[PDB]
Amino acid sequence: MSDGNVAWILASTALVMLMVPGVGFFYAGMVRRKNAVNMIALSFISLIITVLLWIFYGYSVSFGNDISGIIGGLNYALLSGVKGEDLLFMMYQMMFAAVTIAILTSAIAERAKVSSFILLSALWLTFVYAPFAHWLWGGGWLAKLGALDFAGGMVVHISSGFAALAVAMTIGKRAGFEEYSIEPHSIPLTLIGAALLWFGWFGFNGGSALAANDVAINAVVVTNTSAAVAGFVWMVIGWIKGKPGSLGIVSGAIAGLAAITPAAGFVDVKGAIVIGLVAGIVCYLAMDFRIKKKIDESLDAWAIHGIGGLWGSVAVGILANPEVNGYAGLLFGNPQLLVSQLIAVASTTAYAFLVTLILAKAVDAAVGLRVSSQEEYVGLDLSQHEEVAYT
Amino acid sequence: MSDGNVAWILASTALVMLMVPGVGFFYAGMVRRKNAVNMIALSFISLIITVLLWIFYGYSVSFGNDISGIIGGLNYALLSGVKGEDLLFMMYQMMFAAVTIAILTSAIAERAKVSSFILLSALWLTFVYAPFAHWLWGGGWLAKLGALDFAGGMVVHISSGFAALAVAMTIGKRAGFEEYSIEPHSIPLTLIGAALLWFGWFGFNGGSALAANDVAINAVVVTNTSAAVAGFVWMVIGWIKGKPGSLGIVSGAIAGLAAITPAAGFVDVKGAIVIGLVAGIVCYLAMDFRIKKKIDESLDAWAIHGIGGLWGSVAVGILANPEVNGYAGLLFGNPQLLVSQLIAVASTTAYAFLVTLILAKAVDAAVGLRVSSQEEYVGLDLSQHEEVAYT
Amino acid sequence: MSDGNVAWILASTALVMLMVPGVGFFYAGMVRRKNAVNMIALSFISLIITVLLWIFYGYSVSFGNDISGIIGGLNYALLSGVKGEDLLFMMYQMMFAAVTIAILTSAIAERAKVSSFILLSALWLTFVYAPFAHWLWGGGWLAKLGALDFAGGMVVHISSGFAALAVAMTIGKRAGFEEYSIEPHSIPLTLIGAALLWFGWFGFNGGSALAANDVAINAVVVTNTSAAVAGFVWMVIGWIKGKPGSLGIVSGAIAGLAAITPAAGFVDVKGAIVIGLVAGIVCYLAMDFRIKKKIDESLDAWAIHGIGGLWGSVAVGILANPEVNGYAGLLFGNPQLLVSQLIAVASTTAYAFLVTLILAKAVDAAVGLRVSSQEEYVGLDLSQHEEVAYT
């Protein structure tokens, strides 16, 4: 199987798994002390629930026998018939799902019932994630019309980003959101999460070539490039508006990482530089805008991942360099790729937002998404986990 | 040597090394602020001491020329005669030893003299760990009678688990153990440790195939499976008894990881599901039981690793699927494997508990294991390291 | 390209990248709460700035067409002409640069303007790092006269170490440095950084063989060996002088890691033991000495990396074992290698110290390195980032 290739993907899988709690730490540092445990716990739960559902039927629904090009059959339920390298792919893909669910927790920070999140997550994984994976990577209709997504610009970032926006709108602002700022209880904790996310992204984008080859190497180069550019942009903006806070710096880096994800294996360093530069700017604008509109999409999964993934997914159609991976974009003489990307981006963006909206309201109506005001007041660590973060 | 295989084991070795301080963080978050440094420091010391002893003679005693099938000779002392791939194996195995010693620190939390722990650790590594490794993996008597242990259900988990129980009983309860609860000073710190342990377990179980092949892939799949199942079980139990604390969730996940370790490369996903389900239940019961019996085996190395490793090691004899790795268990028509496992489990469990008991008392009699009451009062960070965790 | 080798270097690159924020956490725990964010932020900025400059021209200046054996041309600017495996090497090397810059932040702890550090870093990377890399690894004059540096004893440790000493002397002591001790605000945070540094060093030294072969395996063995020995030494010294603080333990381990870096792929375990033993002693003495001289080279980049790298680089000339990697040192009958090392060490030590001194003063004169007294008083988290570490 090429031990080298198996080695790299085994490693990449471990790396993406680390990103799940990595998201938890990243988010936890930004919420109040009384909700720190909850924020982290959500990422671990996201991992646990994802592994089970993926095995049970999630994998099959994403990559099983195609039906009308919109979803896969149940031929791989309980991994029936999944062997050898297919097992590794299943496992690697399983982790992409988990990270996606964790990113989404941005929209429910400090005020959701754990039980409700689990229910919603299970439904979302079933009706939004699996379909997307199938459409783009499971031989679905989007792949058929030529759409590309190297590492999940759409499958992972647009989905969680826009789903987060829908969820935030459904669950409502946190008490005191408009009145006064919620201060991050531990920026260092968030920076630890940020370090784990950058590190794990090596397996995320680099492992998406599914081999230890020139494409993986390219993905690693441009991934770091876009991250550095977007992080530099936010640093500049930070200075332009005051002082460069560390949160803005790593938030910018992540914008660049999300934007390059769908294009990591198709563009060159120059293209990577454009992608990161634009990502830094548009994502910052997106953040400012949702803030202006007073939407409590708390940790900016939308502005960063949603918008970053949207831009990067479209950028693929403009900058794909055939000398890099055969595929060519607009600037390389091929208008068709751009149209495939726009269709894919338009489709995934609308579906993620609208369907999540339906699922969120459904669950809210069925069991209620938000915790009581008093639980929100005492904090979810105590009220939802009967634990205290620090003593 | 197959660069791919060397690559994977090099990586797996790095991964297992990370698990050592990972154990330190995991444990540190659960003790009081005045003992945080001590708890972490112990894991680093465990690593340092293990590397030296392993090199000096530990490796040789585990994997050197067999003598009566119970121990290895000194032909590899100072790595004399260890070259090429044998060097990599030595290094990979070295890290298993280190993690084992760190897990054991559970039984001495908040009240042991560092010097005494070092002495005990050196003795334990010599008279308990090395023998076990030799018996099962060094061509010892247990391997000869057909016993199997894929990644250390017995060599690592039962040994540390039961040794921890013996040590706890010898050193005695912490002041105020029975009167009032000791609160974890930083659950987030513990969750960081938990994240590092899950991540490193990819190298632990996955690297035990000693190649980037189908067995490693299987080990990685079932390892994540069992972890998710057992973590889900503890989450359910947590809800059944109140609220699902994050500590219970990751403790359950670890129970599943310990249980699947001895079977990672022999069972299928369905078997992995059974193993994790039972592990979650029995380990939770074990925890409750040692608590009822008022034994201060502080961080549950026993209930989690001891019992989890015991179950998983026995489960190998029941669920080994020949279609997975040739070996077959009871349910697959082979009663013999079960008997080999029971013998191995009975032997390793009794020896670990009884011999550790002897060593602990010996050291206690020789130099005294426990710190003075006042040192316990002011905390070991100050009294044993003359340091203060946070300012 | 040997998927196995690409796999290992891809992984090693991820590992070295993690070391950058790893340095940030390591240092952050040792400074005051009011400067925690700043200390970490500096490492992330170091990474961001390094990636950009490396791509732009840093890589080319280090490994491009040689000119007079002191520097490389601009033939690889913007990675023009860099493809395949050369891209991976570029990326792997990029991370070495980033870690070096982060280590250097030791000398400006708690009192530097971020903008000034960036300017200085950019200049230093250009006039000190790139040249060194070229001299030793880019076919420069030092390589030509037979000097060796397996993983950066000189390129990374001596450079940052001595540059840090120069910077510290130029920027001046922190207010109250001589009067009273500055207490570490979070030793646990530092230990997390220490864990990440030890773990990442697997990719640092182990990946320097640029293949998953016997040399990488050796590097990994001796790297862990030297670390354990030096850490044990500091533990002993700690006991000899009082109690073994955890900071001394990991600081000793790092001394051993820095010392073995230039020799990781040339010496045997016995040589590794000598290197770590001496490193522990000389680095401890160096620390005591700079303290006696009242130099506020704050986090001992000099005593640990500077001196550790100096010793290890010289040790290569004494202990290189031809049976390990062909090269032989003094004790193995070859006096020439020792002379090459002394020349290289003398050259790199003097240049790093003197040129950094010039650059630091230049920048200080141009824009001023140090923050105002009041900013130093309120802390750089607030004054330089308008952020608060913990709430």
Side-chain angles (χ1 to χ4, degrees), chain B residues 26-236:
Chain B
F26 185 68
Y27 290 160
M30 299 185 297
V31 304
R32 281 163 291 191
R33 179 178 166 177
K34 66 183 181 185
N35 294 306
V37 171
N38 179 61
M39 209 59 244
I40 302 178
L42 286 177
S43 69
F44 276 96
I45 293 171
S46 292
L47 178 58
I48 296 173
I49 300 305
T50 298
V51 174
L52 302 177
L53 296 179
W54 194 249
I55 294 304
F56 188 13
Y57 67 86
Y59 174 67
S60 192
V61 168
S62 300
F63 303 94
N65 291 151
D66 176 67
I67 108 98
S68 300
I70 75 283
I71 202 66
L74 300 173
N75 55 298
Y76 293 142
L78 254 322
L79 308 182
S80 171
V82 186
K83 296 174 173 182
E85 296 185 328
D86 281 13
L87 266 180
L88 184 45
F89 178 74
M90 179 281 302
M91 190 58 30
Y92 179 56
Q93 284 300 126
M94 177 190 284
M95 299 305 165
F96 277 63
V99 173
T100 305
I101 297 301
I103 293 174
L104 182 49
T105 64
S106 164
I108 58 171
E110 301 189 302
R111 77 275 196 197
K113 301 187 201 175
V114 173
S115 57
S116 299
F117 161 70
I118 294 181
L119 175 57
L120 180 59
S121 295
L123 291 168
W124 196 85
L125 211 290
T126 305
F127 299 109
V128 177
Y129 190 87
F132 279 25
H134 186 74
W135 300 355
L136 287 155
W137 304 332
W141 72 287
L142 287 183
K144 297 301 246 183
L145 56 72
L148 303 175
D149 190 350
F150 189 71
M154 293 176 268
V155 181
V156 176
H157 303 294
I158 283 182
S159 62
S160 66
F162 283 77
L165 184 68
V167 177
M169 284 169 61
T170 303
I171 197 167
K173 309 172 219 293
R174 289 168 283 173
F177 173 63
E178 294 189 39
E179 187 222 58
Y180 167 63
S181 293
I182 303 305
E183 303 305 320
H185 89 279
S186 180
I187 291 181
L189 179 56
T190 285
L191 296 180
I192 286 179
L196 301 186
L197 291 172
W198 194 314
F199 170 63
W201 224 297
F202 274 77
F204 201 83
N205 288 3
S208 285
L210 298 180
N213 62 192
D214 282 351
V215 173
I217 294 177
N218 186 266
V220 165
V221 173
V222 298
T223 291
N224 281 281
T225 294
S226 183
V229 174
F232 184 80
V233 170
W234 280 54
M235 194 182 327
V236 176

Side-chain angles (χ1 to χ4, degrees), chain C residues 151-193:
Chain C
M154 293 176 268
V155 181
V156 176
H157 303 294
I158 283 182
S159 62
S160 66
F162 283 77
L165 184 68
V167 177
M169 284 169 61
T170 303
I171 197 167
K173 309 172 219 293
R174 289 168 283 173
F177 173 63
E178 294 189 39
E179 187 222 58
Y180 167 63
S181 293
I182 303 305
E183 303 305 320
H185 89 279
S186 180
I187 291 181
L189 179 56
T190 285
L191 296 180
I192 286 179

Side-chain angles (χ1 to χ4, degrees), chain A:
Chain A
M1 299 186 283
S2 170
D3 304 339
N5 290 341
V6 172
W8 179 227
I9 303 309
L10 277 173
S12 293
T13 297
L15 291 175
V16 180
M17 170 274 138
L18 183 60
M19 293 179 74
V20 184
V23 166
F25 302 137
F26 185 68
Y27 290 160
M30 299 185 297
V31 304
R32 281 163 291 191
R33 179 178 166 177
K34 66 183 181 185
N35 294 306
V37 171
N38 179 61
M39 209 59 244
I40 302 178
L42 286 177
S43 69
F44 276 96
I45 293 171
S46 292
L47 178 58
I48 296 173
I49 300 305
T50 298
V51 174
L52 302 177
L53 296 179
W54 194 249
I55 294 304
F56 188 13
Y57 67 86
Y59 174 67
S60 192
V61 168
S62 300
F63 303 94
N65 291 151
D66 176 67
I67 108 98
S68 300
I70 75 283
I71 202 66
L74 300 173
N75 55 298
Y76 293 142
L78 254 322
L79 308 182
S80 171
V82 186
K83 296 174 173 182
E85 296 185 328
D86 281 13
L87 266 180
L88 184 45
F89 178 74
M90 179 281 302
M91 190 58 30
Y92 179 56
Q93 284 300 126
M94 177 190 284
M95 299 305 165
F96 277 63
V99 173
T100 305
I101 297 301
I103 293 174
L104 182 49
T105 64
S106 164
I108 58 171
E110 301 189 302
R111 77 275 196 197
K113 301 187 201 175
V114 173
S115 57
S116 299
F117 161 70
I118 294 181
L119 175 57
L120 180 59
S121 295
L123 291 168
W124 196 85
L125 211 290
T126 305
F127 299 109
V128 177
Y129 190 87
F132 279 25
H134 186 74
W135 300 355
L136 287 155
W137 304 332
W141 72 287
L142 287 183
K144 297 301 246 183
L145 56 72
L148 303 175
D149 190 350
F150 189 71
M154 293 176 268
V155 181
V156 176
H157 303 294
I158 283 182
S159 62
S160 66
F162 283 77
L165 184 68
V167 177
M169 284 169 61
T170 303
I171 197 167
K173 309 172 219 293
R174 289 168 283 173
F177 173 63
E178 294 189 39
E179 187 222 58
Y180 167 63
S181 293
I182 303 305
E183 303 305 320
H185 89 279
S186 180
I187 291 181
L189 179 56
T190 285
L191 296 180
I192 286 179
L196 301 186
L197 291 172
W198 194 314
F199 170 63
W201 224 297
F202 273 77
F204 201 83
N205 288 3
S208 285
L210 298 180
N213 62 192
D214 282 351
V215 173
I217 294 177
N218 186 266
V220 165
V221 173
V222 298
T223 291
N224 281 281
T225 294
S226 183
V229 174
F232 184 80
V233 170
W234 280 54
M235 194 182 327
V236 176
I237 294 174
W239 249 311
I240 288 177
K241 309 209 169 236
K243 293 295 182 175
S246 62
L247 295 180
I249 293 169
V250 303
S251 290
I254 297 171
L257 288 169
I260 197 67
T261 290
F266 308 126
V267 304
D268 60 45
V269 71
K270 288 177 69 168
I273 293 176
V274 174
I275 288 177
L277 210 192
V278 178
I281 296 175
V282 297
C283 290
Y284 190 101
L285 292 179
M287 176 183 69
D288 273 357
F289 184 73
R290 70 92 182 168
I291 290 181
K292 176 186 84 172
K293 295 309 179 190
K294 284 159 157 38
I295 300 177
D296 198 350
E297 195 295 278
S298 309
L299 313 175
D300 283 306
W302 175 74
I304 301 297
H305 298 275
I307 301 304
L310 187 168
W311 155 236
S313 293
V314 169
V316 176
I318 304 172
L319 309 166
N321 184 329
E323 272 197 295
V324 172
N325 204 2
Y327 292 98
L330 181 68
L331 303 190
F332 288 86
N334 182 194
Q336 296 84 265
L337 192 53
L338 212 217
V339 172
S340 290
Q341 294 309 101
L342 292 174
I343 291 173
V345 167
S347 300
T348 55
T349 297
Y351 188 100
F353 181 73
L354 298 173
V355 177
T356 296
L357 204 50
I358 292 167
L359 293 180
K361 297 184 171 303
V363 170
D364 200 15
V367 302
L369 289 169
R370 188 170 184 143
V371 300
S372 66
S373 296
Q374 62 270 202
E375 282 190 29
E376 192 179 338
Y377 183 70
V378 314
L380 286 54
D381 290 4
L382 236 354
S383 64
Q384 289 291 114
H385 305 282
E386 293 192 357
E387 281 178 335
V388 174
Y390 317 92
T391 291

Side-chain angles (χ1 to χ4, degrees), chain C residues 343-368:
Chain C
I343 291 173
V345 167
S347 300
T348 55
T349 297
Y351 188 100
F353 181 73
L354 298 173
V355 177
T356 296
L357 204 50
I358 292 167
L359 293 180
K361 297 184 171 303
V363 170
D364 200 15
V367 302

Side-chain angles (χ1 to χ4, degrees), chain C:
Chain C
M1 299 186 283
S2 170
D3 304 339
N5 290 341
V6 172
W8 179 227
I9 303 309
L10 277 173
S12 293
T13 297
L15 291 175
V16 180
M17 170 274 138
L18 183 60
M19 293 179 74
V20 184
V23 166
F25 302 137
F26 185 68
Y27 290 160
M30 299 185 297
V31 304
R32 281 163 291 191
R33 179 178 166 177
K34 66 183 181 185
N35 294 306
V37 171
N38 179 61
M39 209 59 244
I40 302 178
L42 286 177
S43 69
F44 276 96
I45 293 171
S46 292
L47 178 58
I48 296 173
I49 300 305
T50 298
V51 174
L52 302 177
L53 296 179
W54 194 249
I55 294 304
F56 188 13
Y57 67 86
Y59 174 67
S60 192
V61 168
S62 300
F63 303 94
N65 291 151
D66 176 67
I67 108 98
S68 300
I70 75 283
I71 202 66
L74 300 173
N75 55 298
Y76 293 142
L78 254 322
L79 308 182
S80 171
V82 186
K83 296 174 173 182
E85 296 185 328
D86 281 13
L87 266 180
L88 184 45
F89 178 74
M90 179 281 302
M91 190 58 30
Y92 179 56
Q93 284 300 126
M94 177 190 284
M95 299 305 165
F96 277 63
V99 173
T100 305
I101 297 301
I103 293 174
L104 182 49
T105 64
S106 164
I108 58 171
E110 301 189 302
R111 77 275 196 197
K113 301 187 201 175
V114 173
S115 57
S116 299
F117 161 70
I118 294 181
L119 175 57
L120 180 59
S121 295
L123 291 168
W124 196 85
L125 211 290
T126 305
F127 299 109
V128 177
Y129 190 87
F132 279 25
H134 186 74
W135 300 355
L136 287 155
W137 304 332
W141 72 287
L142 287 183
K144 297 301 246 183
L145 56 72
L148 303 175
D149 190 350
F150 189 71
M154 293 176 268
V155 181
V156 176
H157 303 294
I158 283 182
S159 62
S160 66
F162 283 77
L165 184 68
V167 177
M169 284 169 61
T170 303
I171 197 167
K173 309 172 219 293
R174 289 168 283 173
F177 173 63
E178 294 189 39
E179 187 222 58
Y180 167 63
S181 293
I182 303 305
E183 303 305 320
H185 89 279
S186 180
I187 291 181
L189 179 56
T190 285
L191 296 180
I192 286 179
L196 301 186
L197 291 172
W198 194 314
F199 170 63
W201 224 297
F202 274 77
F204 201 83
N205 288 3
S208 285
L210 298 180
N213 62 192
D214 282 351
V215 173
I217 294 177
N218 186 266
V220 165
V221 173
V222 298
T223 291
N224 281 281
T225 294
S226 183
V229 174
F232 184 80
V233 170
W234 280 54
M235 194 182 327
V236 176
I237 294 174
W239 249 311
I240 288 177
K241 309 209 169 236
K243 293 295 182 175
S246 62
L247 295 180
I249 293 169
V250 303
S251 290
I254 297 171
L257 288 169
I260 197 67
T261 290
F266 308 126
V267 304
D268 60 45
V269 71
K270 288 177 69 168
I273 293 176
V274 174
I275 288 177
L277 210 192
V278 178
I281 296 175
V282 297
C283 290
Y284 190 101
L285 292 179
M287 176 183 69
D288 273 357
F289 184 73
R290 70 92 182 168
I291 290 181
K292 176 186 84 172
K293 295 309 179 190
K294 284 159 157 38
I295 300 177
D296 198 350
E297 195 295 278
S298 309
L299 313 175
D300 283 306
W302 175 74
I304 301 297
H305 298 275
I307 301 304
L310 187 168
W311 155 236
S313 293
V314 169
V316 176
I318 304 172
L319 309 166
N321 184 329
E323 272 197 295
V324 172
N325 204 2
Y327 292 98
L330 181 68
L331 303 190
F332 288 86
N334 182 194
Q336 296 84 265
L337 192 53
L338 212 217
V339 172
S340 290
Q341 294 309 101
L342 292 174
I343 291 173
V345 167
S347 300
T348 55
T349 297
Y351 188 100
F353 181 73
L354 298 173
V355 177
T356 296
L357 204 50
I358 292 167
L359 293 180
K361 297 184 171 303
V363 170
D364 200 15
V367 302
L369 289 169
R370 188 170 184 143
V371 300
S372 66
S373 296
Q374 62 270 202
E375 282 190 29
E376 192 179 338
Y377 183 70
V378 314
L380 286 54
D381 290 4
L382 236 354
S383 64
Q384 289 291 114
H385 305 282
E386 293 192 357
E387 281 178 335
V388 174
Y390 317 92
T391 291

Side-chain angles (χ1 to χ4, degrees), chain B residues 342-363:
Chain B
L342 292 174
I343 291 173
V345 167
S347 300
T348 55
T349 297
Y351 188 100
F353 181 73
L354 298 173
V355 177
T356 296
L357 204 50
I358 292 167
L359 293 180
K361 297 184 171 303
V363 170

